[PDB]
Design a protein around this ligand. Sequence first.
Ligand SMILES: Nc1ncnc2c1ncn2[C@@H]1O[C@H](COP(=O)(O)OP(=O)(O)OP(=O)(O)O)[C@@H](O)[C@H]1O
Ligand SMILES: Nc1ncnc2c1ncn2[C@@H]1O[C@H](COP(=O)(O)OP(=O)(O)O)[C@@H](O)[C@H]1O
Ligand SMILES: [Mg+2]
Ligand SMILES: [Mg+2]
Lengths: 90, 513, 109, 470, 124, 123, 36
Amino acid sequence: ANLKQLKIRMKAIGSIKKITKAMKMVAASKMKAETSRLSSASEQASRMNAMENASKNAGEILSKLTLDYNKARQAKITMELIEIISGASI
Amino acid sequence: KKLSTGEASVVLAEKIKGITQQNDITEYGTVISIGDGIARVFGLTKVQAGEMVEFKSGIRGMALNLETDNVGVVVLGNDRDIKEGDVVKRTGAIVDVPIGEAMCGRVFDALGNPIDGLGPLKTTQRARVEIKAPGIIPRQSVRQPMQTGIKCVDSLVPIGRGQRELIIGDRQTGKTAIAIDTILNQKEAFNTGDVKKQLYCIYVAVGQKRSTIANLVSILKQHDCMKFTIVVCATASDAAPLQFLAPYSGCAIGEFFRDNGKHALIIYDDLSKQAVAYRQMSLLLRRPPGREAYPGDVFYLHSRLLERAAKMNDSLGGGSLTALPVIETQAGDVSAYIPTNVISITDGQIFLETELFYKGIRPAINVGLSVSRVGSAAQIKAMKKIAGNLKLTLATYRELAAFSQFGSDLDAKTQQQLNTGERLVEMLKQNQYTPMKVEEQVCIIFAGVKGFLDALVTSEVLKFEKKFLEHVRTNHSALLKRIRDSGDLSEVDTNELNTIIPLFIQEGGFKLK
Amino acid sequence: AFNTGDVKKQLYCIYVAVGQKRSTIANLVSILKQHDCMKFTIVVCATASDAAPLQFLAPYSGCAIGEFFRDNGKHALIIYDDLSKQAVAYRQMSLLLRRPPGREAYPGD
Amino acid sequence: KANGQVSQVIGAVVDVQFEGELPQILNALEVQGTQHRLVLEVAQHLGDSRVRTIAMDSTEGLVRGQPVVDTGLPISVPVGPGTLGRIMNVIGEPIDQRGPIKAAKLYPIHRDAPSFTDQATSAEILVTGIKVVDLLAPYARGGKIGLFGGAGVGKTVLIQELINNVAKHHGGYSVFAGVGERTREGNDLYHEMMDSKVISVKEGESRCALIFGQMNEPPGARARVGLTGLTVAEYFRDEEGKDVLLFVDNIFRFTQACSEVSALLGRIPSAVGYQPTLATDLGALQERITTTQKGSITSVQAIYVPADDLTDPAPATTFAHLDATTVLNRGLTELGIYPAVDPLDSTSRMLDPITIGEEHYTVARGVQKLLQDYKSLQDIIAILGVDDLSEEDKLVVARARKVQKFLSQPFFMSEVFSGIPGRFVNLKQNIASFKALLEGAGDEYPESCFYMKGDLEESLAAGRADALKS
Amino acid sequence: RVGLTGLTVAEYFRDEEGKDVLLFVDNIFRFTQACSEVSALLGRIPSAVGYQPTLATDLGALQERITTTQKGSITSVQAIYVPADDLTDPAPATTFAHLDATTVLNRGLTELGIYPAVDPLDST
Amino acid sequence: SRMLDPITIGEEHYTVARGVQKLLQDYKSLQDIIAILGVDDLSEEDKLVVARARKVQKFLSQPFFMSEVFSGIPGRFVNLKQNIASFKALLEGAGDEYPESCFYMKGDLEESLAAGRADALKS
Amino acid sequence: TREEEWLDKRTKSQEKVYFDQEDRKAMKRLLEKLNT
Ligand SMILES: Nc1ncnc2c1ncn2[C@@H]1O[C@H](COP(=O)(O)OP(=O)(O)OP(=O)(O)O)[C@@H](O)[C@H]1O
Ligand SMILES: Nc1ncnc2c1ncn2[C@@H]1O[C@H](COP(=O)(O)OP(=O)(O)O)[C@@H](O)[C@H]1O
Ligand SMILES: [Mg+2]
Ligand SMILES: [Mg+2]
């Protein structure tokens, strides 16, 4: 399915997953500080949990898209090879 | 059926006439068809596979397909000269190329003809281009380093003599640059006279324009690194068979040194292009095409070549032939056909990234993917120790780089690791045509792993490198001499180094923080 | 423009239908007649039932009709319906002629 | 006297049967009885005194048994000043309608490339007036130049500007061979050169030759017209040590035409439908386009990248032959920046501190790092915003946007599109302008003033003027 | 055919000597790759992703001669290389069809100082 | 469908169909991000669109007579007028307050409202 | 299914807002400075 587009979409999700993972790290640090200081901490806790869930969901989608990219890659090799063989037969 | 190319009207007419005259069919041939640089020849029996043949005009050809009724030949030149009906005589000898010392410092064609114009080539004997690689017994363990001069390579991706290391990367990432940098470092031994270290270099150009080759030769003559290197050229204008033979011709020239106990290094540039030339010859011969239209034995083509780079045992002489094949990946994807083959053949690969090249990381070496099978066994005793710690730190830093943009928000002891990794990467950078001796590498890598660089500002790392080397080279010359002779970083030298480096950082004008 | 006597803006419209169901072209002609825009339009039809060579020549036939107006100081607008369908017909006509196929089985040219 | 005769006609490929003394390969055969001069280029000897050839014109109207004459030499075209200011065909026919072409002699379009010993390479900066090119990918007088672009990114407009900026005020002659491109563009260029007085009807003037093998021409013509233009330049170079400017409009069409007939010629298709001889066919042409001891040739060739896939075999193989490379990016067009020269992908063999000033090299590398760092930040900017970034990162983003907009330059040939007059930027001013931007000279002014401006001083004045206006 | 040669050496010990044999095979992917190359050379039309049509059969021959009998057994430990990290590739897929167990060596275990590299969870 | 035009079918029928398609397309343009991260950071209008699109997508489904053995629920035949009215009221926000489950496998909007009202009544 | 376009639009929009405000400030500050 136009492996070029799939790879672009795969690259985007990886950046999203990476940025979301980093924010979870930052949220843990900031949540620690507030609990030490102790609603603000609640905001940070929800953010940390939400980023974990988002990075998890992004990872699942990235794995699923990787399967499709490998599937598309095999088909492309097969299709090009068939063209070459059909031309060589005659 | 359809027809047979051997059933030509002229040949058939003779049979119908009944006159049994073949004008010495054996050792003589008559061209039946010519196209795209491939000539089919009726007759010419008793011709060995892979043998050279002479056409009426004078151009040679290689008998690659010995069929029942004809011979498919690839012409080694322009196809316009010879036409149908021409006579073909077998030379009687497989393709061979001259070898010797008198070749170092000369540019040659794929067949050994000097094109530089400096004069006639005077050599003793010639060697066959195609022969079998050494067995398992003649070989010996790779225990001797091949100093490229590149800090990143010599430290993290060591190359031992008799090893097959693949320089793989996208276009315009600095692959040919690494090859030339290696050649320059090997010049100190010839100038000094350390026969044990002398490494003759061989550069094979495949599918490259003659302009860049002339520039390449000028650089070698400029740096004087010529007179111990051999350049074999199969340019884009040269026929495909020549681009296919050049690597084997160069490998034979290197086997000369290997057999005699000398050490030689051979670099194949645009090795992937050689496969393209072979594919052309195969498709025009109507051989069954495989993936990406490459023949089935493309892999074989490369194996029998690269496997000829070996470290011969002390009985045969102890010689060696180190290979550095180059590969150009289109979209940085090594899952292609030719990359996978050459990766499976070679020991390790130096993977070059273009994004790193943009970010200012030159050489753009991705240490994550780059790997050497030989490993520490090649490095000198001094490097192995510090190099291990260096590899670990870079691995942790690449893992952490995902949070680089979030620096102050993250806690301490992690942002510190990020800062340390930056100093190292800056230290690993290097200029073009600036190879470093192994002793100087040890001092710099030592300053980096110990952590002294964390004081300086990243922008000043390279200034410290050049400036600190000048001081050590000037004052502490016995220290470097020991590292060079002994080959190991003794405890006393370690303490001496550990004391002067921070002292130099303070008295140095460069700022710190 | 045609209704009003301004010749410098009259534009004869040519519609070439390649590989389309005749029902679709009939509805289109009825629409044109409804708006009275058919008096200056030419419709060339090479439908799916028509042989592949017809679908291959229809665009070229229409273009020649347009060259008439072009060479005679007039202005013509030719609308080639899907040219992908013309390529399919050419591919079919060429493959059946035993000509070596290219990528996606289309002829080299 | 015609010895041969047509035996098989399929598409543009023609087989001929000869009675005796077959012609060497690449020779030109003339078919007799055609309303228009039809030439056939010998490509293969099939045996039985048969040759397979490619037609330069349409084969419609041919008939089996039609006599064919052997010229005994490859396609020869007129060379010399007689071609100056005149449009010529692939076989040398004048299509300008101004009469026959006067030539001292006829040279064949097929010849062996120059030797290695007579390569005579030399590096000398070529001021094109385009700041992005002059800065990031300098051009070398006497070296090949490539413009890689997809469909509608502006490589045709760029060729016109180079002509306007370089062709004029150039001591030597210039050649323009347009292969495969559209005919409408050809008419525009001819009229533009006439208006610009680069070519004229008055003899002894018009220092430029034109060759056109446009789309309408069948395969084989688009595959050999490039060689025709190159042959004219080789005469101007060898016979007179005069600097020559060779402008090749898309060369990708050259390999495309070859592949269109490769199948009918009998070759097996390659990976992406191209002929097996792509590299060698292309290299035979590139090696001839080079500077030598006698003279120098500065070749500017446009490579069309189908679907914006730089991994296609044709442009991928061409990359190796080029000294300077200019990659046009489509994303910039969406942003409005013109020219859409990818600053990072574009490379030049001349981008060396020894060849060019160290300051020039330093300035270029700084720009590349700045733009690359900005591209890396875009991802997190999407999620967090510019506000949450640090001052350092904010300054990087601000300065990079200004630099990227400042890279845009309005050319004369582009006025009709934009409506702003073209501008020419010298090398010194260009380097200083970008050097100042790096130091923060313009971090005060709005980024809008650094758009379609020539020099930094012009941009700063416009910013100050807009303030007094409001 | 080198793989079959080693297999034959082991079959002697199994049948005549009657003892258990252990057949190590350098990554079977190269065996599969070599078979693909001979098929192409022979002119056979390639299969899905460039492999030979006889992938299953060429691979099944070797894998079936490896079994337990009344006299002895041949236990095979073979290396697996996954091209492009695609488990769904024909070669590793047709191979996994035969594997009874998998031993996965992990680099992290080496770093920790444990030097059986096998992973308990990934191994099955 | 070629039949979908304001002249052949009523202008009301066409507007309702285009509104449904626009609603569904807008929701479809947001499914990727909603999958990666929830709808909380999503705007208020976009969240209303998401809720309404789920309702409409569920309401599109209907039980068939021939499929009665599979599901076990009686099939429904929906007249054209009832269909248009149901979707018009749904776009206007009639059943937005109720849960989306009441629209699953329902014949007409009134059936879904009665089930939704009973669910509101039970609690 | 296009997440890359979403990020690109997000990036462009936020940059434009922030730097449009900066352009306002820069015109005002330089105008104040040019008048004297
Ligand atoms: N260590 C380096 N530091 C700075 N610039 C470098 C360095 N190495 C290479 N460059 C530059 O990167 C470019 C590539 O050089 P080089 O030809 O050696 O690589 P390449 O990949 O083989 O190119 P090609 O694809 O044409 O063969 C050149 O412009 C070179 O000047
Ligand atoms: N400097 C420019 N400024 C504004 N618009 C441009 C500029 N260059 C090109 N355009 C547009 O790009 C298009 C031309 O692209 P072109 O150079 O012809 O590429 P190609 O030769 O592949 O067709 C035109 O629509 C033209 O209006
Ligand atoms: Mg190179
Ligand atoms: Mg163009």
